[PDB]
Amino acid sequence: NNTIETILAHRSIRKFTAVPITDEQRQTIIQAGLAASSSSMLQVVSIVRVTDSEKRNELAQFAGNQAYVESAAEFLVFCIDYQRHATINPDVQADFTELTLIGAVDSGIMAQNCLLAAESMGLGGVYIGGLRNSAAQVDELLGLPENSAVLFGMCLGHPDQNPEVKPRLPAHVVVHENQYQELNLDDIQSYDQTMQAYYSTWSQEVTGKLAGESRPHILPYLNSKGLAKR
Amino acid sequence: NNTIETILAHRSIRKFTAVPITDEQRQTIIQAGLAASSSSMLQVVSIVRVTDSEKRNELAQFAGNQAYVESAAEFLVFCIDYQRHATINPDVQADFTELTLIGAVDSGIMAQNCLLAAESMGLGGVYIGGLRNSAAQVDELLGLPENSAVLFGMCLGHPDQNPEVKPRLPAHVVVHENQYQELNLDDIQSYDQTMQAYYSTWSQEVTGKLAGESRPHILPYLNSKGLAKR
Ligand SMILES: Cc1cc2nc3c(=O)[nH]c(=O)nc-3n(C[C@@H](O)[C@H](O)[C@H](O)COP(=O)(O)O)c2cc1C
Ligand SMILES: Cc1cc2nc3c(=O)[nH]c(=O)nc-3n(C[C@H](O)[C@H](O)[C@H](O)COP(=O)(O)O)c2cc1C
Secondary structure, eight states, X not given: XXXXXXXXXXXOXXXXXXXXXXXXXXXXXXXXXXXXXXXXXXXXXXXXEOOOHHHXXXXXXXXXXXXXXXXXXXXXXXXXEOXXXXXXXXXXXXXXXXXXXXXXXXXXXXXXXXXXXXXXXXXXXXXXXXXXXXXXXXXXXXXXXXXXXXXXXXXXXXXXXXXOOOOOOOHHHHEEESSOOOOOHXXXXXXHHHHHHHOOOHHHHHHHHHTSOOOTTHHHHHHHTTOSOO | OHHHHHHHTOOOOOOBOSOOOOHHHHHHHHHHHHTSOOGGGOOOEEEEEOOOHHHHXXXXXXXXXXXXXXXXXXXXXXXXXXXXXXXXXXXXXXXXXXXXXXXXXXXXXXXXXHHXXXXXXXXXXXXXXGGGGGHXXXXXHHTOOTTEEEEEEEEEEOBSOOOOOOOOOOHHHHEEESSOOOOOHXXXXXXXXXXXXXXXXXXXXXXXXXXXXXXXXXXXXXXXXXOSOO
């Protein structure tokens, strides 16, 4: 069917033309996102649509000079939001890590619906997690209140590049039957050879990134917004 | 188009027939999940397929006595997995909170592709966050190693019910233009009235749950697995 063909044809697009996304298409992308499942129907996700060209230039820099944040037809920022709940009832305890986990999982579900809706219309896109490296600055720029935090952005627009589909680890590595199965390093070596053909190896690149520190300012940032304190 | 029609037609299915999901259908649902975007191509999601009927009964009780976990044709468990990376290179530091946020976001994105693929074939499903009620006991049952943690499960199967689509908060409440906008409590009242017509109000029910403690055992659980320590 068309749904599965769309899911399997995905590739991140990082070059866009200047053709805008119509109001009808944008309203449909947001509705597709809203139709996503929500943990306990809590509805903990907020989207900040950035149209101001000066804020977009600042966001591209805050993302690590990723130019497509400025050139994209639409830039959406996904945020955890327990301020809606806190405004309704001030007795809400939003600082439990469980709530940040729900915020992250639900944001991913919603965002994927938005991206899939866009891709089905012939649009292209890419998630922007780079915003987290300058989290406090992005948070202030968007005026996010207490009980709210930035997670990632999303570029949407008409493609001006056609990259090849990137291979993933095989299903027998990622999927386990009944109990977790120990890793066979021969599968990692085969995947590394598959990635070298597409393009330092994959395993050497990813484990080398994790051998150092991974954005150490993230927990103090979440805590400063009143999230994940216990 | 068909992808958008499938996305908007979603409703959680909690009643299934005894008809199984074929091998061709299951392999497609997994391949759809793998086609999802991955933060820094880290591929930190592991899926545990539970076919053992004795384990299913235990998971149903651990999930807060949710019978559909036992009667579903397929029950997939989504987990954060940095053990594959640690097996390749022991020097990997997997304890930074940033890495748990990547794990949670990436799992949500992957899981949604799996559900959408299933829903497009005429199947139904529901996410099961209830596994977190007894996270440490669910972890021991599935044999998850260090640097790995359970997030949620997913029931999949042929529907034996036809629920009406549940309305969400309007687009103007969830989407903010350029800067975060303050909440107009009239919109929450309008929404509560829309939810009363569908069926204490939505706003009072969700904020009442958040006024209590939300799974306080979660951070210690992640910490016990070597995750979210700093
Ligand atoms: C990660 C996550 C966890 C969920 N866990 C449960 C669960 O344990 N039990 C259940 O019956 N529903 C669960 N749901 C499903 C719903 O509560 C649901 O999405 C919702 O109330 C909105 O209804 P709909 O999906 O039918 O539109 C979960 C949803 C998400 C996104
Ligand atoms: C939450 C998340 C954040 C991401 N952040 C970035 C980013 O900041 N910039 C970028 O160029 N791509 C980013 N990506 C996209 C990928 O690097 C990408 O999904 C990947 O390498 C696999 O390639 P494909 O999506 O083309 O299949 C992100 C993906 C996810 C899931």
